Design a protein around this ligand. Structure first.
Ligand SMILES: C/C1=C\CC[C@H](C)OC(=O)C[C@H](c2ccc(O)cc2)NC(=O)[C@@H](Cc2c[nH]c3ccccc23)N(C)C(=O)[C@H](CCCCN)NC(=O)[C@@H](C)C1
Ligand SMILES: Nc1ncnc2c1ncn2[C@@H]1O[C@H](COP(=O)(O)OP(=O)(O)O)[C@@H](O)[C@H]1O
Ligand SMILES: Nc1ncnc2c1ncn2[C@@H]1O[C@H](COP(=O)(O)OP(=O)(O)O)[C@@H](O)[C@H]1O
Ligand SMILES: Nc1ncnc2c1ncn2[C@@H]1O[C@H](COP(=O)(O)OP(=O)(O)O)[C@@H](O)[C@H]1O
Ligand SMILES: Nc1ncnc2c1ncn2[C@@H]1O[C@H](COP(=O)(O)OP(=O)(O)O)[C@@H](O)[C@H]1O
Ligand SMILES: Nc1ncnc2c1ncn2[C@@H]1O[C@H](COP(=O)(O)OP(=O)(O)O)[C@@H](O)[C@H]1O
Ligand SMILES: [Mg+2]
Ligand SMILES: [Mg+2]
Ligand SMILES: [Mg+2]
Ligand SMILES: [Mg+2]
Ligand SMILES: [Mg+2]
Lengths: 371, 371, 371, 371, 371
């Protein structure tokens, strides 16, 4: 019965089977609650919508994510989703086969531990394993050496691996991610009278940025040219047919990844976060890391993110260092892909945590890391 | 013994049984009082006529409605009618079975509360329920999503429902209704020497408008073409054989629904009342509301009301929004039909307020709303 | 050559010049036709008497009013009168100067239109204007805010004006007027054997009521005290010296204005007609209207009409509202006075409809209303 | 000639001179248009009333605000007002001296830009400056550190300032404001049969809430005690002397500020809006912000708003944090007061935008922000 | 006018006068820059805060150290501090008297040279001298023989002195110091959801470790006992009242000094660094060094650092060697104390480098070392 791979991340959940080349089910990790009145209850109707069903009824629901900044903040809702994923969407009964879950590095221990508990107690998972998202992304590329820049709506992080050996001590992690980009866009659009405020509207704004936003190659020049009407300006058609003129914001929003101060984020831009994480490692390694900068995660789907990353990291490094950014198609699936690969590996099977094994050992087992 | 459905609205009362496809008894909610002399009393004769009996003797009675603008202004008379409805007209003894009553949203609480009191104290109703007229209208259509424009002689109102979930916060209500249309017609006909002034005459005028009036598709053009004698002009034959030439008024009266200022009504025309009520709701919903504009209530029987509504709402909305007005046959029965349907529902039975239940709880129970 | 002001109302015609403080000619709008035999024709003699000449020969003429309920019912006769007014009585040739005519609001359009036609075609009027009687009455008072209760033998009506701005939408009009009072008096006097039946006799009865009738302050008490012989009873001396004892009728006739049902008039008494017309207007206005109740028109010459009006309107209104009825001397001339004033205004001259202007434009021009 | 300070906000305009301790002229930013008929035009009379003159004639005008939600929606009308303010009401000729204008943060750029344009092109303003309302409010208090909760009928917003340094990144803004409170009150009063619907009536309702409404300290308990007749109930005397019994609504209306869902406002109550805005800022700052919660703006004149705010914010914060709400007298003038102070500052003079300076630079200059 | 002693180290600057028993001024060598917005400039306000003033305004500043790992990385900022130290904080004018500066051994020559330059060119220092921190520490103890383990937030180093004669050839130096401990603590606290990321927050974390951290005597046993809730766990109260539960980390952070690999530091723990530095020296000396292990510097304020150091160094050495660690009170002032002593010595005066002397000789003079 093989095994199930579930990219239970923030934003979207991507699930499919070990051995598949792509997730079979992709949908938002969103729980929607009937906003007006109470619910109905007596006439059924529903007091809870999940993912794409929440999207169908979006406008009458208060939308909540259970995961924020890579952390399961609302366990009740997350549990509800998990059920709705493989149990309802994939037509899978827990006990049929074991499953792979993921998380971003440097989470609170409790995040992983409680997640595990649920898999074994709420569900009948017959063996489970948790892996670092960035690591999986590298597996998807097939490389054994490089920097993984994994950036979603939850978190942005850098993992450094060299010839199969990870370097724990230099892993970087930022709260700065897609939701901050989204929130910033909601804010910045008030400059032109386009006030989005509800959770439902927030999702529209996300739709906008995923279609129109791009990374300024040279922000200064883009701002200069933005003083003149041009191809910069786009007309976004809303759900109710009214249209929005997007100007400078089309690139100013992505800009925040390189100038975090825009949103109050007292930090370094991702080009420096990356640079510095490389600087933290031995000089004997750095040369290779430079030429294997694997970029993945949905925020890296912005057009030009690779081009400008290349530009700025090149500027920071010595001119004699050759830098190469890897940015394949399907970056949005990279982690999941890695998972499919991982689970299909013969050797890997020894890493499974059997429910019984867990029951015998207890919580702490989920942090073991041999490979 | 099933249950009784009673559309106890202003204007007309339409009663029949739960499970019927149409009301069995339809008649005016009018109380007539012998105008000349006193009454008779000693020789019987009668000091009160109701509905169709008042119509028979119309010309010697002062006619009063007990309900005005959806509010039971004269309880004595309304009580008298209720008796005369099911007790006399339908041949029903209260206690045989429970009954469904209706009202327009945003009434004074006392309207519902006192009505309830009477059902349980004056009559022996063994369980009673009150429903919003617009909601019922939507049930009659069978849709779960849309705008209900319910307009009678009492009030005009807009209710927005989405996929089974009502949106309380955006319900609109106007005093502007059929009696204002009627009163205006009485007034406007003095332009041609046709002065109607009594309550009895008022009813004639109502008869006129229900036969000849129509909604101008393009009011301006109709006024222009009205400068020439044509098919516009009609000869109405009065009760005593004298005839009336109706001109421009044939459409100028319905015009007031779109230009309320004609009667001093500082408001927005119903095309804007509708438009705005949609604007009040989330952009994620508006698209669907546009395509499910359910129009019902007797004033919507004017020929062309749908055509022009379509025209003007289309003009207000974006050209990319598809708008569809639903305007079935039997719009005049829609609310009652919905009631028959509602009462026939198995689930619905839990909503009944048992007389005992009321007696135990008290007044406030009539505003509970779970479903 | 200034201009001519003509209060061409029902009952009496009052004409004088713009700038005069009172009409120069006042006489009945009555056409009398030799009742017995034919006429004479061959020996001249006359087949038509008008106004005061008809009064001279009253007893051998059938008297007809051309205007009834404010409407020119008999154009032939009205035309004849108009000639006899300014042409014969005032010694004026049409073309010397323009003229102001009046009418009660809510007349049939044709009333005004045909009147206009005659002024320009039968006569040589070099510019003409028609004004609402009530409006003019307010001008005579000099106020810019108030209720005008204008009541003659033709009609009774209420006009509401606020700070120079009329409120069309709340104008009230009743058929109930002086001729109904007169007719009722003719009828009620048969109780004591004083049967008046001819048109000539009708005029006597009018003379009676204009001398003896008064408004009961408290009708109930007056009826009670009327059971005892007192100052109530008066001896009216007829044209032939016989005398009439008037009792209760002396106030019971005016009573009908407050209890219209007495004459079959299914309506509200004038105290409620007034009250309600105020209720029809915005709460922000009503307070002022209460304190500016301008009463005018000949029927308001009954002693006590103001006192009782005050009483009953006060009762209807809230005790905190201050009510003041204006009832100057010369109420019988108020409309005409207003006309004199109006015509003397510099600004007003732009309102004249030049004969040529009319000829060019046509009928419809008489309903323009800019000021 | 000093300078002019003009709190050109929504609702009311408060103008006075730099150095004054209070505005000299305070009046509604309302434009009224003769509702019935047309206007008059030819006889003058007026086709436009502003502020207190519109209040005088309130009942015959359609009242419009030009500013809605802090945005000048109707420039024609706003221009008209500006003229009527200092030009007519204060007896000031533009060019005599420079002026200070204000606006709520996060407005559309065009709001400020167009406003500027008018000051320099329509008027002869010799130097102008625009400031954030909340900032000015803090200046009025004299503090350099704190939270400014500025809430009017337009918008509600939170600004955080620390030791003279603003924190742009954590400014909050809500549409939820006084007009929503007012509109809600209009609606909620239909429960007791007090239907207010016109723009004129809306102003009455505002008058009601400004006199009777208060903030429930414990809403639940107030609702419980509201089941019994008590001091809760008040008799409001309307403009026409009729009285209104206000019950639960007297506090249920203010309740919406803490439970926005009441009006469909999918948001957080102002106690959480405030709390969260503090949470958005560094832990090293939060302690001070807690003890300097400066509340201002006219909606904060509701009795008990401070008491309950204190209660709920205290509950949300840790028990060890000391919280202090500043709520001086003259909260309604706070912004203007700050303006007077600001303009009187020597240093501040460098911030003026000279008309010439603007003409040379152009639009963008109005968003400069050095201090 | 005596002389000034300035422990211009990383972390804190401790200044006082030659002859004093303790520094008069102690404050952080931190420069803070207004993080949000720009600054203010025009209204003054300040664009730079130093030490305790930066602490006052901590939360709105980006905090930077100018010294890192014992090296003045940012000269601009360090210069600024020096001014703010004696010039502003101590109320001293440079030229009043000569001054003693310090540094950690094995710095880049330029560190000392540039520092000197500034003292003579930026300031008017009339003679200056630079001494090795460890040497001074030994002077403070009063011993002439021993190992000085001087460990601050900048660097950790070992100096060996025997009977007044230093042994240059065996001086050890590590980057591993207090900031690594601090940074590690920031990281390790994410295990329990306590994410500190800003420079301001970093300072809080430092405050935490300086209050709660201690050195595990037996790390293994502490980890074992840490599996059970006990006295290990502490509740730290943050600046905003929220509390933090510190567990294992309370000793795991100090552990890194003995197992540097925890932070990627491929080195030997300080117990072996010390041991080995002794091994590097002649067997005829080692015996004495063992009995005079002078520990100083702020990181040695962790409770138990002496106890465990004793334990582990004893284990490494032969059982017959007597080992004694000196760990007086005021270890945090040791270097400065030594400086006060040094400057007060008569003989020592010959070591001063006169400004003129420097000007004549040039840069190289600062590395002379006779005594
Ligand atoms: C409508 C929408 C996007 C499309 C806007 C429309 C199609 O285009 C415009 O009309 C531009 C037009 C505009 C153009 C030019 C100009 O100088 C001043 C204003 N924007 C406004 O007026 C603002 C008015 C407004 C109210 N608070 C605000 C807060 C900030 C900014 C604006 C507003 N405005 C459209 C909205 O607020 C509305 C209502 C706000 C939602 C919650 N209440 N917005 C929305 O509901 C969502 C769907 C976003
Ligand atoms: N076309 C796109 N352009 C930019 N960002 C995108 C695009 N599609 C998705 N994203 C962003 O990627 C994130 C969602 O996908 P993903 O990053 O895979 O989520 P997660 O990594 O949390 O599973 C969001 O930030 C989303 O907006
Ligand atoms: N043929 C018609 N054309 C227009 N209006 C009609 C017609 N028949 C009935 N009406 C109007 O509908 C109202 C009466 O029916 P209805 O609206 O159902 O009353 P209610 O809704 O109050 O029960 C009146 O306004 C009536 O004039
Ligand atoms: N003394 C009076 N008392 C009561 N009514 C009078 C008196 N004089 C005239 N009227 C009434 O006024 C009307 C005639 O004058 P008027 O009202 O001015 O006529 P009109 O208004 O039609 O020009 C008649 O109803 C007449 O009886
Ligand atoms: N006594 C009061 N109680 C409550 N609210 C008030 C009171 N007086 C004024 N307000 C409200 O304050 C707003 C008007 O004053 P203000 O808030 O200063 O307007 P703005 O801030 O837009 O200038 C309105 O919401 C008004 O109802
Ligand atoms: N109570 C304490 N416990 C542990 N370390 C401390 C304590 N107080 C200060 N320190 C550490 O000492 C260093 C600061 O003082 P110090 O070591 O004298 O600085 P420096 O030596 O650079 O002048 C920092 O590492 C600081 O955290
Ligand atoms: Mg991801
Ligand atoms: Mg109906
Ligand atoms: Mg008259
Ligand atoms: Mg304000
Ligand atoms: Mg040190």
């Amino acid at each position: 019965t093989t095994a199930l791979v579930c990219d239970n991340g923030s934003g979207l959940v991507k699930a499919g089977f070990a051995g598949d080349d792509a997730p079979r089910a992709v949908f938002p990790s969103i729980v929607g609650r009937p906003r007006h009145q109470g619910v109905m209850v007596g006439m059924g109707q529903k007091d809870s919508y999940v993912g794409d069903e929440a999207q169908s009824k979006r406008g009458i629901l208060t939308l909540k994510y259970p995961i924020e900044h890579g952390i399961i903040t609302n366990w009740d809702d997350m549990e509800k989703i998990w059920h709705h994923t493989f149990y309802n969407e994939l037509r899978v009964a827990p006990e049929e086969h074991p499953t792979l879950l993921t998380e971003a590095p440097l989470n609170p221990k409790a995040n992983r531990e409680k997640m595990t508990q649920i898999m074994f107690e709420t569900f009948n998972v017959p063996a489970m394993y948790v892996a670092i998202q960035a690591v999986l992304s590298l597996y998807a590329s097939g490389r054994t050496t490089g920097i993984v820049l994994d950036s979603g709506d939850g978190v942005t992080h850098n993992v450094p691996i060299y010839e199969g050996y990870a370097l724990p001590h230099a892993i970087m992690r930022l709260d700065l991610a897609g939701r901050d980009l989204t929130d910033y866009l909601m804010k910045i659009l008030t400059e032109r009278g386009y006030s989005f405020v509800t959770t439902a509207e927030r999702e529209i704004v996300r739709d906008i940025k995923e279609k129109l936003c791009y990374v300024a190659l040279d922000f200064e020049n883009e701002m200069a040219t933005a003083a003149s009407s041009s191809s910069l300006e786009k007309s976004y058609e809303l759900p109710d047919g009214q249209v929005i003129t997007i100007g400078n914001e089309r690139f100013r929003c992505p800009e925040t990844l390189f100038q975090p101060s825009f949103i109050g984020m007292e930090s370094a831009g991702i080009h420096e976060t990356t640079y510095n994480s490389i600087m933290k490692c031995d000089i004997d390694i750095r040369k290779d890391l430079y030429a294997n900068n694997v970029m993945s995660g949905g925020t890296t789907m912005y057009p030009g993110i690779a081009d400008r990353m290349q530009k700025e990291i090149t500027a920071l490094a010595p001119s004699t260092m050759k830098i190469k950014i890897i940015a394949p198609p399907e970056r949005k699936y990279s982690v999941w892909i890695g998972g499919s690969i991982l689970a299909s590996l013969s050797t890997f099977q020894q890493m499974w945590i059997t429910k019984q094994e867990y029951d015998e050992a207890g919580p702490s087992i989920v942090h073991r890391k041999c490979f």
